[PDB]
Structure formats: C-alpha cells, structure tokens
Tab-separated table of C-alpha atoms and ligand atoms in Angstrom:
chain	number	residue	atom	x	y	z
A	2	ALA	CA	-231.573	3.067	28.925
A	3	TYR	CA	-228.993	1.019	26.855
A	4	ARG	CA	-229.089	3.367	24.056
A	5	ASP	CA	-227.312	6.043	26.250
A	6	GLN	CA	-224.753	3.561	27.835
A	7	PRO	CA	-221.200	3.263	26.124
A	8	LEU	CA	-220.651	0.220	23.919
A	9	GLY	CA	-217.590	-0.851	26.024
A	10	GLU	CA	-219.673	-1.160	29.242
A	11	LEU	CA	-222.683	-2.883	27.524
A	12	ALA	CA	-220.006	-5.384	26.024
A	13	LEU	CA	-218.535	-6.174	29.377
A	14	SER	CA	-221.956	-6.146	31.428
A	15	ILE	CA	-223.971	-8.311	28.985
A	16	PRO	CA	-222.988	-11.722	27.995
A	17	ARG	CA	-222.972	-12.405	24.202
A	18	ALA	CA	-223.611	-8.598	23.375
A	19	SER	CA	-219.956	-8.857	21.871
A	20	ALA	CA	-221.227	-10.881	19.149
A	21	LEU	CA	-224.330	-8.832	18.797
A	22	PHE	CA	-222.060	-5.806	18.396
A	23	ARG	CA	-219.854	-7.803	15.945
A	24	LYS	CA	-223.030	-8.655	13.865
A	25	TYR	CA	-223.631	-4.810	13.540
A	26	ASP	CA	-220.006	-4.035	12.925
A	27	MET	CA	-220.278	-1.748	15.981
A	28	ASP	CA	-216.670	-1.325	17.411
A	29	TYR	CA	-217.097	-1.822	21.220
A	30	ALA	CA	-213.167	-2.598	21.447
A	31	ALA	CA	-211.130	0.593	20.214
A	32	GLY	CA	-214.598	2.813	20.147
A	33	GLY	CA	-215.939	1.611	23.412
A	34	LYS	CA	-216.627	4.973	24.566
A	35	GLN	CA	-219.304	5.733	21.986
A	36	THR	CA	-222.828	5.371	23.005
A	37	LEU	CA	-225.013	2.835	21.429
A	38	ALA	CA	-227.491	5.855	20.269
A	39	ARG	CA	-224.532	7.353	18.143
A	40	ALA	CA	-223.138	3.961	16.814
A	41	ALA	CA	-226.824	2.768	15.776
A	42	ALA	CA	-227.326	6.291	14.274
A	43	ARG	CA	-224.492	6.395	12.338
A	44	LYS	CA	-225.338	2.970	10.534
A	45	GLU	CA	-228.945	3.832	10.174
A	46	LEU	CA	-229.878	0.782	12.533
A	47	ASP	CA	-233.384	0.890	14.742
A	48	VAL	CA	-231.767	1.367	18.313
A	49	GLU	CA	-235.241	-0.117	19.732
A	50	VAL	CA	-234.655	-3.523	18.473
A	51	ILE	CA	-231.059	-3.374	19.422
A	52	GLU	CA	-232.192	-2.220	22.951
A	53	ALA	CA	-234.554	-5.131	23.044
A	54	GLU	CA	-232.181	-7.931	21.798
A	55	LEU	CA	-229.392	-6.677	24.563
A	56	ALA	CA	-232.496	-7.236	27.201
A	57	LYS	CA	-233.015	-10.622	25.900
A	58	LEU	CA	-229.188	-11.456	26.221
A	59	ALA	CA	-229.335	-9.919	29.605
A	60	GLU	CA	-231.881	-12.102	31.081
A	61	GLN	CA	-229.163	-14.968	30.348
A	62	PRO	CA	-226.832	-16.522	33.188
A	63	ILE	CA	-224.455	-13.633	34.366
A	64	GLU	CA	-220.983	-14.214	33.310
A	65	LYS	CA	-217.589	-13.831	34.714
A	66	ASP	CA	-217.434	-9.875	34.989
A	67	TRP	CA	-213.704	-8.495	34.493
A	68	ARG	CA	-214.407	-4.836	35.382
A	69	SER	CA	-213.615	-5.135	39.120
A	70	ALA	CA	-211.421	-8.183	38.673
A	71	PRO	CA	-207.833	-7.630	40.256
A	72	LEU	CA	-205.491	-6.218	37.462
A	73	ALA	CA	-202.959	-8.885	38.066
A	74	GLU	CA	-205.730	-11.697	37.203
A	75	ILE	CA	-206.645	-9.408	34.092
A	76	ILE	CA	-203.181	-9.300	32.802
A	77	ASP	CA	-202.484	-13.148	33.388
A	78	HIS	CA	-205.900	-14.003	31.540
A	79	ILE	CA	-204.893	-11.766	28.519
A	80	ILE	CA	-201.435	-13.233	28.246
A	81	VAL	CA	-202.755	-16.998	28.172
A	82	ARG	CA	-206.488	-16.523	26.904
A	83	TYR	CA	-205.392	-13.992	24.103
A	84	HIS	CA	-201.474	-13.339	23.322
A	85	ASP	CA	-200.775	-17.243	23.258
A	86	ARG	CA	-203.852	-18.093	21.355
A	87	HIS	CA	-203.160	-15.323	18.599
A	88	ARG	CA	-199.429	-16.577	18.439
A	89	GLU	CA	-200.844	-19.914	17.520
A	90	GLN	CA	-203.577	-18.957	15.314
A	91	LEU	CA	-202.078	-16.471	13.045
A	92	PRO	CA	-199.296	-18.756	11.732
A	93	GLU	CA	-202.028	-21.412	10.911
A	94	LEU	CA	-204.113	-18.601	9.041
A	95	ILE	CA	-201.181	-17.582	7.122
A	96	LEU	CA	-200.707	-21.181	5.663
A	97	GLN	CA	-204.182	-21.559	4.895
A	98	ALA	CA	-204.498	-17.995	2.904
A	99	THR	CA	-201.331	-18.967	0.895
A	100	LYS	CA	-202.869	-22.186	-0.210
A	101	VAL	CA	-206.385	-20.720	-0.933
A	102	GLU	CA	-204.783	-17.723	-2.794
A	103	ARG	CA	-202.666	-19.986	-5.023
A	104	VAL	CA	-205.269	-22.693	-5.580
A	105	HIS	CA	-208.174	-20.338	-6.351
A	106	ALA	CA	-205.968	-17.633	-7.826
A	107	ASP	CA	-208.262	-17.904	-11.203
A	108	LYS	CA	-211.484	-17.397	-9.121
A	109	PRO	CA	-212.869	-13.739	-9.178
A	110	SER	CA	-213.899	-14.561	-5.644
A	111	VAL	CA	-210.413	-15.549	-4.167
A	112	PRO	CA	-209.530	-13.226	-1.486
A	113	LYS	CA	-206.279	-11.636	-2.881
A	114	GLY	CA	-204.007	-9.856	-0.646
A	115	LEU	CA	-205.327	-11.797	2.355
A	116	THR	CA	-202.057	-13.749	2.846
A	117	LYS	CA	-199.965	-9.992	2.961
A	118	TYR	CA	-202.699	-8.692	5.556
A	119	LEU	CA	-202.523	-11.727	7.875
A	120	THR	CA	-198.886	-11.393	7.704
A	121	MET	CA	-198.797	-7.944	8.761
A	122	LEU	CA	-201.340	-8.540	11.360
A	123	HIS	CA	-199.062	-11.171	12.797
A	124	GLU	CA	-195.946	-9.136	12.564
A	125	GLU	CA	-197.177	-6.092	14.267
A	126	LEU	CA	-199.598	-7.847	16.636
A	127	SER	CA	-196.339	-10.163	17.752
A	128	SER	CA	-194.131	-7.172	18.390
A	129	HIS	CA	-197.090	-5.084	20.291
A	130	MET	CA	-197.772	-8.106	22.589
A	131	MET	CA	-194.075	-8.512	23.451
A	132	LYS	CA	-194.012	-4.843	24.532
A	133	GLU	CA	-196.913	-5.405	26.673
A	134	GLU	CA	-195.502	-8.493	28.390
A	135	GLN	CA	-192.170	-6.928	28.649
A	136	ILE	CA	-192.846	-3.591	29.994
A	137	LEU	CA	-196.645	-2.498	30.328
A	138	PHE	CA	-197.979	-5.471	32.125
A	139	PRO	CA	-194.920	-5.794	34.757
A	140	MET	CA	-195.220	-2.169	35.411
A	141	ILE	CA	-198.793	-2.489	36.167
A	142	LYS	CA	-198.251	-5.548	38.391
A	143	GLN	CA	-195.391	-3.707	40.155
A	144	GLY	CA	-197.762	-0.721	41.379
A	145	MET	CA	-196.449	1.876	38.515
A	146	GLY	CA	-200.077	1.753	36.674
A	147	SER	CA	-200.716	5.514	37.245
A	148	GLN	CA	-197.429	6.128	35.494
A	149	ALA	CA	-198.218	4.388	32.134
A	150	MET	CA	-199.736	7.122	30.281
A	151	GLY	CA	-197.000	7.025	27.733
A	152	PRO	CA	-197.101	3.240	26.967
A	153	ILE	CA	-200.924	2.961	27.039
A	154	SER	CA	-201.140	5.959	24.671
A	155	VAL	CA	-198.887	4.056	22.047
A	156	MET	CA	-200.770	0.667	22.757
A	157	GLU	CA	-204.087	2.231	22.101
A	158	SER	CA	-202.982	3.872	18.925
A	159	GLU	CA	-201.617	0.163	17.723
A	160	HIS	CA	-204.938	-1.141	18.695
A	161	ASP	CA	-206.650	1.301	16.245
A	162	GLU	CA	-204.082	0.049	13.796
A	163	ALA	CA	-204.795	-3.553	14.428
A	164	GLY	CA	-208.546	-2.622	13.761
A	165	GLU	CA	-207.819	-1.182	10.351
A	166	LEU	CA	-206.117	-4.465	9.182
A	167	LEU	CA	-209.355	-6.220	10.378
A	168	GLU	CA	-211.486	-4.203	8.516
A	169	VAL	CA	-209.156	-4.583	5.297
A	170	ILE	CA	-209.385	-8.584	6.086
A	171	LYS	CA	-213.096	-8.428	6.394
A	172	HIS	CA	-213.460	-6.062	3.176
A	173	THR	CA	-211.033	-8.865	1.398
A	174	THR	CA	-212.971	-11.679	2.317
A	175	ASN	CA	-216.638	-10.302	1.585
A	176	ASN	CA	-217.035	-9.634	5.466
A	177	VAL	CA	-215.993	-13.200	5.997
A	178	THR	CA	-218.363	-14.924	3.829
A	179	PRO	CA	-216.997	-17.746	1.634
A	180	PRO	CA	-218.263	-17.900	-1.856
A	181	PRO	CA	-220.634	-20.966	-2.890
A	182	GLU	CA	-217.482	-22.708	-4.772
A	183	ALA	CA	-215.549	-22.557	-1.500
A	184	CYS	CA	-214.066	-25.959	-0.295
A	185	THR	CA	-213.035	-27.222	2.964
A	186	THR	CA	-209.702	-25.313	3.354
A	187	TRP	CA	-211.319	-21.826	2.496
A	188	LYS	CA	-214.455	-22.589	4.762
A	189	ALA	CA	-212.287	-23.568	7.779
A	190	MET	CA	-209.953	-20.727	7.391
A	191	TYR	CA	-212.770	-18.483	7.316
A	192	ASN	CA	-214.105	-19.741	10.534
A	193	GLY	CA	-210.584	-19.286	11.884
A	194	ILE	CA	-210.343	-15.720	10.815
A	195	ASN	CA	-214.129	-15.157	12.568
A	196	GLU	CA	-212.607	-16.410	15.632
A	197	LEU	CA	-209.277	-14.554	15.292
A	198	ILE	CA	-211.547	-11.406	15.184
A	199	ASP	CA	-213.957	-12.222	17.806
A	200	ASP	CA	-210.926	-12.876	20.184
A	201	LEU	CA	-208.964	-9.765	19.352
A	202	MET	CA	-211.890	-7.438	19.637
A	203	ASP	CA	-212.450	-8.973	23.051
A	204	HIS	CA	-208.839	-8.981	24.084
A	205	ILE	CA	-208.535	-5.095	22.619
A	206	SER	CA	-211.673	-4.230	24.735
A	207	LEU	CA	-210.349	-5.841	27.996
A	208	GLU	CA	-207.488	-3.662	27.533
A	209	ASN	CA	-209.058	-0.459	26.319
A	210	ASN	CA	-212.091	-0.591	28.516
A	211	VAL	CA	-210.879	-2.117	31.531
A	212	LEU	CA	-207.317	-2.809	32.093
A	213	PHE	CA	-205.864	0.487	30.773
A	214	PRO	CA	-208.166	2.854	32.518
A	215	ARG	CA	-207.869	1.273	35.910
A	216	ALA	CA	-204.297	0.943	35.654
A	217	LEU	CA	-203.902	4.658	35.101
A	218	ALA	CA	-206.354	5.205	38.012
A	219	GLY	CA	-204.206	3.553	40.406
A	220	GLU	CA	-206.044	0.581	40.839
B	1	CL	CL1	-210.686	-24.833	-0.285
B	2	O	O1	-202.719	-6.300	22.503
B	3	ZN	ZN1	-202.499	-7.080	24.548
B	4	ZN	ZN1	-202.507	-4.599	23.183
C-alpha cells in the first residue's frame, strides 16, 4: 500500500526510490511526512504507475538501512559523505558558473543568476553545517538528543530554505537541462549540480527523517 506510506519511509526502505522521487520532483527530504498519494495527486501523476515502479526497485538488492543504525554512526556518515563533500563541491560549481555566465552572457539560454544562487547556498550551508558539527551532533552523541528540540527546529527551518534555493537553481537551469549549444564546462557543471542536489536531498532526508526524530525520542 505504497500510496499510503510517507515519502520519507519509501526513500529510506527502497533503493534508488530517491532518484525516482527526484524525477517526479517529490520532496521526500523536507516533505518526507507527506504520503505518496497526496504528493502524486498534487502533481496530477498516476499513483498506480509510481506504485508499480517502486515495486520493481523493491525487488533489487536490499541496501544499507539507516533507519535503525546507531545515531553516532549516522552522524559520522553525514559529516564525511555529505558535509565534507558539499564543502568541496560548491566552490568548484561557483567557479564553473562564473565562467559559464561570463562566456555565454549573450545567449538567451545562459543561466543568469546561477553564480549568485550557488554562492548563497554555499554561504548558508557552510554556517548551518558548522552549527550541526559544533553543537547538535555532539549533543546527540553525548546523550542529550531528547533536549535538542530548539536546534532541531532551527535546522529544519534552514533545510526548507536550502530547498527553496535548490528550486531557484533548478528553475534558472531549465531543470538542470543544458541547452543544445552548451559545451563541456556547461554540461559538466550541470552534472555537478545534479550530483549536489542528489546528495543534499539524501543528506536532508537522513537528518529530517532519521536522525532528528530518533534523537528527540531518546535513541
Ligand atoms: Cl561551455
Ligand atoms: O545539514
Ligand atoms: Zn547536515
Ligand atoms: Zn542540516
């Protein structure tokens, strides 16, 4: 009964479901409590077809399941797999976008504003991740997860803001689709943007859907 399940649980229980939800622009990361039914209905999508596709993915080799993993292990995974990679990814994308916007300034397809939006994302995500690393993650490791309502509500609000920047980035780049006349830098940059989006949604999903609720529950 997949349509009646929350998007968060689906993304965390079925491998490559994340990419499927990315394809349909369903926010399993910050909107992970919403049922598939409501998500699909809002987008005028055929939920039976989506239920079928999830079933196909569900037959595949059962991946690493973070839902019951120890919180300290989730934390260490986040820091290394996501926070450190974002800190490397964003500066590079910023350089590339600066070049693309300059070199192709005359083209109507140029993603005007992209450098600015990536710069904002980098600045905001950097300060956010530092707060997590300095206070929230240590407090959870030190058994104070049940006391983290304050920081968690702020971090979740900031996750929603990161989502809004991702939407603006997607809009500016025609849903990260390079035009016919794009060359190697522009195409490679769009591949990097898709990778950043994929990673950031999975990162936010792991925080919002696993780490934060389990921490508050005293696990
Ligand atoms: Cl190019
Ligand atoms: O984060
Ligand atoms: Zn984080
Ligand atoms: Zn976060």
